[model samples]
Structure formats: structure tokens, C-alpha cells
Target chain A: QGVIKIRYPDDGQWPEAPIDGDGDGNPEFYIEINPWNIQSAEGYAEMTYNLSTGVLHYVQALDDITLKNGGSWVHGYPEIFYGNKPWNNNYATDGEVPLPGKVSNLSNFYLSVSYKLLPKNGLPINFAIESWLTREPWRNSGINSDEQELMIWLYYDGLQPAGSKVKEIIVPIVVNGTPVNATFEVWKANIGWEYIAFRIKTPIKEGTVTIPYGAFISAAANVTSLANYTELYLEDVEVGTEYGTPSTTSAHLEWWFYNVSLEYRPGEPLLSQ
Target chain B: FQGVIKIRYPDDGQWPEAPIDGDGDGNPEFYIEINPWNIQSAEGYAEMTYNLSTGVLHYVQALDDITLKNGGSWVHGYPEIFYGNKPWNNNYATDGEVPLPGKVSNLSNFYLSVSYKLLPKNGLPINFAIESWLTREPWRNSGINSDEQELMIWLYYDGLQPAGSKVKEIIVPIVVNGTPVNATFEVWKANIGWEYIAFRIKTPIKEGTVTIPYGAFISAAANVTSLANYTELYLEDVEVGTEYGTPSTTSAHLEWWFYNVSLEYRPGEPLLSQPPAE
Candidate 1:
């Protein structure tokens, strides 16, 4: 079970994996075309999920990654309730203003992913990250709890001083059992464009672990509530697996943003890195 | 024309005239005389005068306070033309000037006439009125005390007016005690020009005491009291005209002095009777 061979789709497609990488009985992966890519006959760029491998990949040449959380440009619009459109989905047309949860955009997940196998074991078995996104009508906190509960969009350019908007994503943790103190940190680097990385470390205790969903959002309340001007980038999540399932599972993830970058937990390795 | 009656005070060698006061005291203690010679006659009766001590005057002039006493005869009477329109009838010209038309002046002939008639020639009741003129004597000018200067108006009967009837014209001058002020010769009768005042003459004539009738003119009081010393020939016909200029103590004023002087009378009987000799 250590170092099991896992399959993954192509860089731009998602959900299929085969032992195509040097024949180590591990399958290389490939992704199917997006069912929700309802753009046109030509289709829009998007990614799909594999319930088994718990991996996400680009599904088609047009599967372009819309910004989840505004990246590094966190300080631009720091209000708790500012509209940030990440998926380009119209709210009235799509029914929900979704965001990335847990292992979300690339800006901060790089830090957490490095800690995937880290300091604690037997974490939540359902720890996984996924995202539901939209654009067109970015909503502030007043629209719904979704906008307030999510932080998954990127800033336009967190690495460039052009003062771009980054990605924003949201993660919801179930609070049941032993309080799985999911502590997330905001990593802000005064780089040329000022990227802010949001990293989370979930500690496993003896009793049934519970993560406070409301408290998780409230804790990163300052980071997620940024407006649409600058983007904050969110990376894929980093988690320590629970019940032998991948650490990325059970971690609900959704990101929304235009353009941004964020970095967190430097020199600390992630379990899934 | 019927003969006229001439009432007089005791003979003191002084003719009938108006009272005057040469001094500034409130009482009128003197009498003034213009020689009838001035009016082309050597002798005549005084038309106006004044007295200083009693502030009572035969004529109204300078004295301030005045008194109205009872029982003095008003010598003037109405006659044939006294029903008004006779030219020479003194009552007709009572409020006017002299010489029959113009007033008395320095060298001109001037006279004041009054007439009354109680008989008629046709044996009718229309009695003819009598008329006469009055003047001041040339001699004895200022002896208001012993002289008993009084106003003398002569009444004559003509066979023209109503028979056994009388004419009533009033001469109200402010009276000090009971004497009719001589100079307030305003008159009004049946045919006279002026009308009557609201108040009537109630008292009858008394001897040596003449009271000006109510609603009658105070000739001098009317026109002369306010005259300046030198105001000569004062004759004002307009009712509202100034009576005289500023007052004086010595000489009589002569400006147009008819201020507030008016005429009034009753038709039935005479308000005055003849006085006995003084």
C-alpha cells in the first residue's frame, strides 16, 4: 500500500489512468471531455473528477482553468463581502455560486500538498478537495452564504506588480467527533506582485474528528472576502490520508477568481507533493 | 316817519357812546368818542365804547374776561324796513359798513340806523317802521365813569310795517354784569339777511343794565377786541374772517373785525325796552 501505482489523465484531460509511465504496473491517466462544458459546439475548457483515484485533470484541449481564487493580490479588496467571479458562470442560470474546497487552486495548495504525508496520521478518511465554480455575476457576502463561505479565486497576477486580482476558494469541514482542528495560515510574500498563500494543517485526535465548517470560513474570513479587483491563486490541496483513502479525499474544495497567485508554508513539505 | 325814542343816562354833559379803557388792565374803564363832526356832524350819540375796571364795555375792544349781566336796555330797534330790505334802515346794515354803503372812515359821512314801525297808513295792520342813526359827540371824548357812556339806538315808527307789531333783532355782546355791550350791533329780523342762533334771548331789558342776547354778535368782542391799536377801518363781511389784529389798550382798532360776529332775532316781541334818563 506504500507507493501504490496510481493512474492519471493527460495534463489537460481528466479521469482515466493507465500504466503508461515506464510500465511500473501503475497506469498513466487520461480524462474524458467535459459534460458541463456547455459553451458551444466547440466546447469550453474544463476539468473532470475520478471518484476512485480521487484525482482531477483537464478533460479537453479547451479545458482551460478558470481562476478559483484571486491569487496573491489579497490586500486589494479585503472586505468580508465583495463579489468575485471565478467560474464565469451566471448565478441565475447556474443556480449556485460555487467555489473550491480544500485542495483547491495552485497558489496555496503547493504548500499544503507538500505536507500530505506529514506530522499526523489517520486523518479524516473523506478528506478530499473539489470545486464548483461560475463567473458572469460575482457575488459579495450579501448574495448568499456561498460567497462568504468560499475562497478559491486567484488574483490577476500575484507574481507581477501589475496589481492583478487572484483566485479565491472555499472549504467546508464537517464538525463532528474529535474537533479536527483544521488550522489554516495565510502566507504572504512581498514578491514583485505580492502573492498570498493559504495553507491548512489538519491534526488528528483520538475521538471522532470534527472540523468546524462555520469556524473554518470565519477564520479565513479576511482572506476569502476579497473583491474582484485582484486575484488570489489557489493550488491543489495537501492532506494526510485517513482510513487509507487518499488525503485529497473528504476535503471539500471550490475556488473562484479571475487572476491571482498566493504562496504559503515555505520549506515545509506536503504529503501529496 | 314817526319820531324815534332816545334813552339816556343822567345828563353828565356826555353823549351816548361805547366804553373803552386806555390802560392794559382787564377792566374796561373808559369810553371812546369819534366826533360826530368826523362824520360831518357837530353832535351825535356814541356807537361803541369800553370800560376797564368792570371789563364791561359799551363796545367790545381790548378787555380779556367778560360778564353777562341782566336788565340793561338795548336801545337799537327795527322799523318799516326792519322787516329787512330798507336801505337806510340801520338794522339792515347792522353787519355791514357805513355811509349807507361803505364803512365809517376818517373824513367820510357815516351813520348806524335802526327802525321799527307799529302803524300803517291804510288803516291796515301793516305798520310803517321808523329809522334813525347814531354817532359819538365831538366834545367830551373819554369820561366813561361819570359820563355813563352807553349805546344809544333810536326806534321810530313808520306807517309801513304791521300795526301794533314789533320787530326783534338781537345784538349779543359779551355783558359784564348786566349791560348790553353797545358796540355789538349785530341784528336780524323778519326780512333781515342773517338768521337765528340756537339759543334764544330769555330776559327782558332792564334799566342801566344791558345784557347781550345769546346767539347775538359781540360787535367789538366779535371784531374789535383783537384789533391792534392802529387798526383803522376794520370791516370784515366774511363770517370766518379775522376780527382784528393783535389787541391794544388805548385806541380802538379799525381793521376788518367781524370774526365770529353773527346775527339772530325773534319775530314776536322786542327783547329790550327804553331806559330812563340817567
Candidate 2:
């Protein structure tokens, strides 16, 4: 099949109301085409995906700023990878707050994704693989409050992470059958939620690396924030591109993906009697 | 997938005798003891004997349940037999003992196989299961551990329930000697400080050999959310016994025959199945 595109309406609501990627009513990852500069933008912002294949994830924005701090998120796929069944992002009545499972739920879990970020006309952009966690359960009625915002910058240039650097630590990541003691600088800020970022000391622009959840969690908990790595649950795992520019020309953030998956391993036996 | 075996032992109380190898003659040993005897309040008495030739513990017991003790269905005693170390070393019958096959670190993968029958009076309430006590200490304390746990697997019950609340219900397969027993069980837990978990067979296997996963019972209690602090405890003692009582009867006679029992604990044994997904 070719490509199926859906665009946001003038009222700034999600396109097609409910974007059931698998047509199963319960969507795990939906294409969110939000341009930070949606008001001053001239071109369109949407996602092109097919049921048989993956997704043609794209977001366009010529101008920007003002959503969750300085600039709009532009484009991202907010996902509930692990959650209750029959979850429709829109019209859930109580609250559309999506949180998947506990950090421990990702106990022996790993996120593997191979991708090539395609940014047009040199937009100061980066691949923001982020997770918003909460300590409490998803509120059925009121807006669920957020406690931590963990962002993993895959590639970036001019755009800086939220807040200043805290410390540099080595995270053991498996990169191509090799143990990579990857160093990432932890950053923090008080931008509403306890904003936290673990930016790599050396960015891997177009390479694949298997990120471990155990060390990543301990690293987050090491930093002084309202977020406890063991206590919070990953309600939303947004994987997409975040970009913005002051130029008046239309720009595109096309992130090509070949593989992305989660892994779970059996726990070790206790007794050896 | 072609077997569903259900069992029911007759109430005749005349269990066939099996030869006892009390002298290490390639047969199982039989050691009987009537500890915690309470005749006045419990109003029950047991007559027991062990024969080297026939391997039968000529066990006979009758208790009057005209009235209960403090409104409690009093247990006269766990008129039982011990396979491992006994508490207080008071009921030490066998002259020697050996180590177990493995530890209970990864319990869900281990199982206990036993063959027995219960003959309770008309409608007397009684219970019996594969019981194992554990301690966290490295040494064999034999008594109570720092964090105590009395793991019981019930195979027979008249009207008796466990000590704690009903946590959940799961159907675990029964396997004997590397073969499926074609039986399923409904397990429940009582988060009583030391964690009391009981697994009762859906179908009473009164007169048949049964295999059950005792490790699943431990994991069930450990994951009770409220009692989320269970650990790898060292085995203290293991037993197969009965606790019988009368509600308001004249005399209730019962007999629990221990025909066959086996605890298979193979540590680091290549797993037959993968652990449940996290």
C-alpha cells in the first residue's frame, strides 16, 4: 500500500478523532502531528502510516514556541505500549491521561529502535524519545498529575535540553554485541514537572543501540528530583521528533525506522537446594 | 491434553499396608509420633504402631466433639510423621538423616508428589497437606526462622479453610515423575505475617498419588501486594500430617494413611517452561 495521512483540525484536536493504528480500537502508538507554531505555520503537519507496514512519521513547522515551556513539541507519537484494553486516546470520558505500567514493569525490558533522523534545511532539532511518569494511578476523572519527565536525546545540535547539567554517569548499554559504557550527562529543571534529561556525551546520530532499563532507572533515581525511579510508572512513552526554527520556510522532520521493539527476560531462580 | 484424573478414597479407614525400609533396605521409612496430645479439651486419642515387615503404622483415632474448646474447632494434635529435622528434637525417630535434593530459591518450578487417603467420620472436618517450614538463616534452626513461613498444600478437606483471606485463584498443573498427573488445583493465600498459603485440589485425590507445585504456592503469597516481602528461605522441616476436630458430635473416628510421599527439589534443573512475562 502507499501512505495514509491524517491532519489536525483547526480547533487543535487530534485528527480523525481516534487514530486506531491497528484498527483494533485500542491504539498502542498513535501518530501525533502537532506543530509548536501551529498558529503561525503555513504548511500542514500530519502522519502517513499504513496498517500492513509501520509508519511514515513526519511533522512540519516553519515557525514556533509555546506548548510545554519554550517551544511546541511539533510532532510525536504518544504511546501506551503497556496498558488496559480498549483504550481510545480520545473520548475516554474520565481522562485521556495515558500511563503504561510501572518502572518495574520494564524490569527486564529493553527498548530497541533503529532509525535515521531526516531534518530538512538544517532545523535546530533532535529525536526526543521521552517518557512522562507519574507516582499515582491514572485518575479516572481529573487531569492526572505528572511527577517526572525523562527525555533521551538521540541526536541534537543547536537545541539544548531543559535546565542545566547535573552530572555525567556511565550507563552500560548493549551496542551491536558489545558492552558500551556510554556516558550521558543528566540534566534537571523545575519546568512544572520535574524535568530530567539524559543526553549522551557523544550522540549516535544514525546508529542502533539497545538501551537497558535497569541502569537508566537507577540513574534517574540518583538525581535529586520529585521522581522516584522505582515508584513512578511510564504512563506515556512519546517517540518522535521535536523541532522548531525562527526561519519563515517550511521544514520537515522525517524519522525513518527499520526496527523498534521491547524485550522481556525471565527472572533468576532463588533457591539451589 | 488427553487426561483428567479425579480421585476419591473410600471411608473404610482400612489402608493397605506397604513395607517400611526402616533399615535403609531401598524402601521408605515410617516414623509415627502423637505430639501435642490434648485428651481432656481435645477429647481425642490416637492408637499408633509401625511394623517393619508390613510397613504399616496401625494408626487409629477417635475423638468426642460434644463441645468445642473456647468456641474453636480444637486440633488434638498433628498426629504425624517427620521426614526432615523436627522442632525441639523431641520427636526424633529415625537415627540418621540426609540432605534434600535442592533449595526453594525458584520454587514455582519444583513440586511435591504424594499418595495418601483420608477417612473422616461421616461429616467430621479435617485437613492434611504437604507442609514445609523454612528459615532465612544459613544454619538449620529446626524451630522457627527469623521470618517464619508455614507453606501448606492441602489435598483433603471436609469443611476447613486456611488462616488468611482469599488472595486469588489459579489452576496449576500436577506432574509426577516427569509426567502430567492430569490434575489441576485452585490455590488461595492468607497473608498472616509469616505468610500462610494453602493449595486445595479441585477434585479430592483421596486414594491416589498426587503431584503439586509447592513453589507456586510461595510465589502466590509473595505477590500478594500487601505481603510483598517474601524471600528465599532455607528448608527447616517437611511433613505430611492431619489436623482433625469435631464440631458437636459424640465420637468422630478418622484415619489418615500416608501411603506414598516424595519431595522433588532439583535446583538449576533446566526449566521445562519460561517464567511468566513481567
Candidate 3:
């Protein structure tokens, strides 16, 4: 375990700020160590990060902090998914939540992810890979409006996506370097912004799933809720588990991520300035 | 080796009254035309002995224009046989047809081959080139308009350079004498409204027989122009012409010639359905 072990602290804000994969001050990518309810004073949470290996693990070292609200995350939306942690911990306002162009406006995009969950006796979790695409121009703040939230649930115990299944489709994708015909149930949730998610037919324990952007964008095009898929701009892709236990359960989590990469190759060599 | 066919100027005949649509895609395909510009004192004729069925052509072009000046669009016209649709700057859009029109996307197994034999010529700015036009939209314009591009493939040239500086030095798969080979071409471009580009063979081909895939140029054009996909562009015009500078009237005669030319495309929902020739 050659990594930077960040022990738990009193505040989720301090001690374990998102580590820079490189010293480039681009901390937009990291395994979020957000125990949203840091005031529990129960036990605490720690995280391990390796820049080169792209290996990230979040251990609930001794998380005696029981999940609140009767073990149900349905009605009351108190706190939610901790999005991309900022590069600078200094002046992070609500407006400056997700850096827009750190990875924005992707037309021809492909995302591949591989991960593992080990030795967590009975921990309730839902691991997912997500990306936010928008129709509006790039913004300086977190909200690039007219957005579409696309997600792929890798493995989940008892967690429902924000939408209902609309249709089923089979798209070709690469899994661990081999071409495979993968199937998914497409879901659409029309809220303030567009929501599209592809829940895989078979959940993987630990493997690679490379999904091309054309697969989902075209899937959403048929919904008729939005305009053509050509206008959508994408930037953020986050992979993590959603945890909220109602009871102070005695459990630990070791979420190991092997790889997460984004690729964009269009026409000839478009950029030669 | 086929018989000789001569088409002289002074009077090159009107457009084919009822052009043959051999490919039978409902498009009136090929026709011969003699473009004689500023013919001041030039007297010449182009001799082309062609066998369409076997796709072979032999030519003996003779011109004598002594008073023609250098650095001018002078000189007599270019006698050319055009395929696909008429030139983008045609006077007859009312009587126009497209051989392969409007987003003929899938180019995986598509190709275009040619066997040209160029004869030596005096040091003059003359180019025996193959040309085509592409546009953002399918509408055919009478002249170069915005969002349209012209691609020139120069097989033989003398003292003539492409519009812009060299942008890419790349190799493309081509069928040489019916054998697969990767040929190098210098990609040059000039952004005029749509685009102006040329694929000039690095090693000037004095005489060569090769089959070129449309996708090679389309692929490179896609990259060179930053297209979202190669399908974004559609081809319109195709022609083989010889352009020359103005020689002084009564000047010594000039002659140029080449042979063996053919174009083939296949198997798209709308394939280039074979031309009248076999």
C-alpha cells in the first residue's frame, strides 16, 4: 500500500483536502472522503491516494457514526453527493463548486473505469460512474445550466437512480480490452435539467467498462425531451460510492479504483497550433 | 493502346443534348468541354484517343500563342471531361445531376484509381490535375461560396505551387499498378470562405498508375479541417483539366499529353453505379 494515508480529522473540510494527482493544482479528480456528517464525533474516516497508479481507497477506519434519518434517503434530502473537490481549499464558494473546463465541452468522448470492493462484511453502498453534460455555454460557477446527468451504476446493494427505466438497448463497448456487446436499461428523469442513466444488465465485481459518448447521447436523443444531442457539452466525470447508514453500524469500506480515463480522438489531428 | 480522338477549339459543341446516364442513378454523368480563356492569338487543338470500355486515353495537345504574357490567366482554354455533377460554378444548375451526392458517409471500402502517362513539356506553369468540390451544404453554387472546399490532386505540374504552405506530410494507402502501396502527399490549405486544399504528390509522378481511396483524402480532410466526422463533407464536382499560363501571341507552339484515366466507386446505399463504360 504505497500511498498517502490521510487520517481522519474533526472536519471533512480540513486534514483530507482532495490530493492533487500531480502538482498541477488540478485537484478536480479525487476519491471524495466526505463523511458529510463530520460532526458525529463517532469514529472517523480516512483515505489512501496514489497518483501514478490512479488507485484510491476510502476507509471508514472506524466509522461508528450511524447514518441519520431512519436509514432511508428518500423523502428528506438533507445532504447529498459530495461533487468534485476544488484544487484550492482557500476560497471555494457555492458558485465555484465544479470547475467548468477542467474537462468540459466533450463532443467525441469515451470514459473507461475499473474498480473493486473488498472485505466490507455488510456495508450498504452503491458505486456509480457519473458525468454532467450541458447545453448552456461554459460558466465560471458550478452550474452550467440545461444540464444532463448521465450515470452508470456499477454495483449497488439498495440504491435507486433518480429516474425510471424507459427503454433497453444493446451497445458495443470494450471491457478489459476486449470488445463486448453490453446491454443497459436506459432511464430518463426530467427535472429542472435532463437526467439520463444507463443501468447495466449485469453488475461487475471488478472489471473495465468503457462506454463511448455516442452510445448515451444518441440514446437520450430519442427521448424528445431535449433538442439534438449535438448541443450537449460535457466536462465532469466522477466515480464513487453513495453511503448513508441510518444506524451506527460497525462496518468498514475499502473501495479500490484501478483506472479512470477519458479519451477524445476526432478527425485527423484537429489541433496543431 | 487505343485509337486517337481529337476535340479542337474555335467551336467545341454545346453540352451533350441528352447526356448519357450509364450508371443509371438518374444523374446525367460525364461530358467533354473545351474551356478556352483569353485565346487572343492562340491556335490549338487537343487530341484524345479514348477507349471508355477499357478506361484508357491517349492525347496530343498542340497550341501556338506567341503574344501570351506570363503571370496572367491568359492562354487558350482547357479541354476536360467532367464526371459526377457539373462544376460548382456552372451556368446550368437547371440541367445538373450528382453522381455521388449528399453525405455518402460510409467510405470503408471505397476507392478511386487512375493510370496517367504524362509526356515531357517545356518549362511552363501548366498543371494536369484532378479536381473536386465539397461543401457544408449540398446546394450547388455557381462559384466558390462560403463553407465549401475545393481539392486539387496535381499529378503533373511545372512551376506551380499550391495555395497555402505545407500543413501535413502524410502517407495514404493507394493501389499502384493494381497493387496496394502507401503513397506520400503534401497537404496544403488556404481558408477562403469554405476551404481551398490540394494533395500534391511529393514525388512528382511523371507517369504512374494508382488507385486512391476517397477516404484517404476524406479522412485527412476531416483531420486537417477538424471535422466532427468525415461524413460532414459531401463531394460534388470531379474533373481532369490542364491549366496553362498565357504565352505571347504568335509565340512558339506548346503541347502536352497524358493517357489511361478511370474513376470507380462502389457499394454505398448509393454506390457510384458504374459509368457508361465497363
lDDT for each candidate structure:
0.22, 0.52, 0.52
lDDT tens per residue, model 1, A76-148:
1111111122322211211011222222321122111211111122222222222212222332211111112
Number of the top candidate by lDDT?
3
TM-score of each: 0.18, 0.41, 0.41
Model 1 regions more than 4 Å off: A1-135, A138-176, A180-182, A189-198, A201-210, A223-273, B1-278
Ten-residue region with minimum lDDT total, candidate 1 chain B: B68-77
- Per lDDT, what order, best first? 3, 2, 1
Q: Please tell me which model should have the higher lDDT, number 1 or number 2.
A: 2
Model 2: fraction of native contacts: 0.00
lDDT of 3 by residue, B1-278 (tens): 43323455434442211233445565444555555433433455545444445545444556554332111223334545566555333422212333444564633234555666655356656666777777545555434333446777776676666655688877766676667766788888754323667888766665667677665675566556522233565676566766555333343233433344455555443332221110
Point out where model 3 deviates above 4 Å. Answer: A1-273, B1-6, B13-29, B37-41, B47-55, B66-78, B89-99, B104-109, B137-141, B226-230, B246-259, B266-278
lDDT of 2 by residue, B1-278 (tens): 22211111112122212223456655344344554322233354555555444333445677564332212224434566656544433333223232432235543245566766778877776777667665554344324421345667777777676654555565666764457754544556443223455666666655666777655555554444222124545454567777665434456587766665556655655313432212
By lDDT, the better pick of 2 and 3 is 3
Interface RMSD of each: 65.5, 25.7, 27.7
Candidate 3 residue-wise lDDT, A63-106, digit = tens = 44533222123111111122332221222112223323322233
